[PDB]
Amino acid sequence: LPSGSDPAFSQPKSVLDAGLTCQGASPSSVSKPILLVPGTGTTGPQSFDSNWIPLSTQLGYTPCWISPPPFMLNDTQVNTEYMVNAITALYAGSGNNKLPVLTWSQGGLVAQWGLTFFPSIRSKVDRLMAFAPDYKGTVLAGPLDALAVSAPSVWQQTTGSALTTALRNAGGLTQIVPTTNLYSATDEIVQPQVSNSPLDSSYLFNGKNVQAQAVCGPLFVIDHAGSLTSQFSYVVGRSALRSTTGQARSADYGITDCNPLPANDLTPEQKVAAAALLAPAAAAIVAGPKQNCEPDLMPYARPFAVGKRTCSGIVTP
Ligand SMILES: *[C@@H]1O[C@H](CO)[C@@H](O[C@@H]2O[C@H](CO)[C@@H](O)[C@H](O)[C@H]2NC(C)=O)[C@H](O)[C@H]1NC(C)=O
Numbered sequence: 672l673p674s675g676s677d678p679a680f681s682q683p684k685s686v687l688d689a690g691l692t693c694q695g696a697s698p699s700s701v702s703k704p705i706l707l708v709p710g711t712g713t714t715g716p717q718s719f720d721s722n723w724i725p726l727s728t729q730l731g732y733t734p735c736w737i738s739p740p741p742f743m744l745n746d747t748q749v750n751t752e753y754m755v756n757a758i759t760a761l762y763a764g765s766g767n768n769k770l771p772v773l774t775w776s777q778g779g780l781v782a783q784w785g786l787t788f789f790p791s792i793r794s795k796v797d798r799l800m801a802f803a804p805d806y807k808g809t810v811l812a813g814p815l816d817a818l819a820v821s822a823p824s825v826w827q828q829t830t831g832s833a834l835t836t837a838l839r840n841a842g843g844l845t846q847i848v849p850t851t852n853l854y855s856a857t858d859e860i861v862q863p864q865v866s867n868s869p870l871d872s873s874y875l876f877n878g879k880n881v882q883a884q885a886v887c888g889p890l891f892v893i894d895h896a897g898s899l900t901s902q903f904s905y906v907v908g909r910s911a912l913r914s915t916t917g918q919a920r921s922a923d924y925g926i927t928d929c930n931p932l933p934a935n936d937l938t939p940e941q942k943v944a945a946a947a948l949l950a951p952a953a954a955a956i957v958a959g960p961k962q963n964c965e966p967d968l969m970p971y972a973r974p975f976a977v978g979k980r981t982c983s984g985i986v987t988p
């Protein structure tokens with residue numbers, strides 16, 4: 672696992688600073704903050720204000736989020752700089768206190784990629800609560816790439832990419848901070864997720880990997896957005912955030928919690944919105960950036976995906 676000094680950011684900090692926001696507080700003076708990293712095609716609010724912005728608020732957190740432009744459709748490596756910048760600012764901003772990271776979809780891959788290649792933040796993140804993270808990418812994007820209708824981070828999230836290869840090769844498929852991964856064998860976006868083992872895309876060695884059906888049964892069906900918004904997710908979500916061990920506890924959730932509807936504590940307006948989650952996402956993808964190659968990896972990661980091929984050609988250290 673890499674250690675040492677962090678790679679430099681390719682982006683100006685004022686730009687990285689532009690990407691962060693806290694609900695009713697400044698990053699420099701925010702208390703009990705939680706960082707929220709959105710999925711492909713969305714801004715922090717589009718992903719979380721019908722769900723975890725309101726939910727982390729009632730559990731006593733000040734929701735802060737990053738919104739890398741354009742809608743998380745860009746080089747995952749750059750989206751990560753926004754996260755590193757934010758954590759650095761909030762640990763500082765809350766008095767050099769560690770902070771929890773809550774992610775959705777690509778956001779979990781960003782959290783892990785930063786924890787892997789930017790050693791400084793390992794001591795600032797208290798725990799990682801990840802909903803439907805695609806650490807091995809997704810087998811479902813095959814069409815999209817042979818289809819070359821893909822935004823940079825779509826190329827990077829396809830199983831077999833130089834980026835997911837680099838993450839596995841650098842040792843990032845193991846938990847760096849106490850991590851709880853909540854996911855569904857019935858995810859329509861990220862696959863595979865059916866074996867309740869290391870083969871799943873959401874799985875991290877030593878993490879608390881919660882495959883929905885392994886708790887609720889083979890008939891329990893929750894989708895991609897419902898992995899983030901459901902009532903079952905709130906119960907494990909809250910367990911992780913309250914846990915002394917940093918991961919969700921079994922004693923905390925059971926069969927009674929196997930409710931797939933949006934969380935009970937949401938207003939109806941919020942529940943409707945949470946049910947409609949992928950709409951803003953799908954639109955942005957159709958509407959935003961495309962390309963026929965995977966963006967090039969940054970120097971710091973090339974030696975971990977040597978031989979793979981990106982925009983420029985074959986990868987060499
Ligand atoms: C999207 O990420 C790309 C790919 O890395 C960024 O493009 C680079 O711009 C930086 C800093 O502004 C320069 O150091 C590099 O020379 C560029 N590389 C390539 C391949 O383009 C881009 O800045 C990001 N844009 C947004 C809106 O996030």
Ligand SMILES: *[P@](=O)(CCCCCC)OCC
Binds near residue numbers: 775777778809
């Ligand atoms: P996630 O970032 C979820 C994005 C949902 C968009 C629906 C079209 O995806 C991992 C590939």
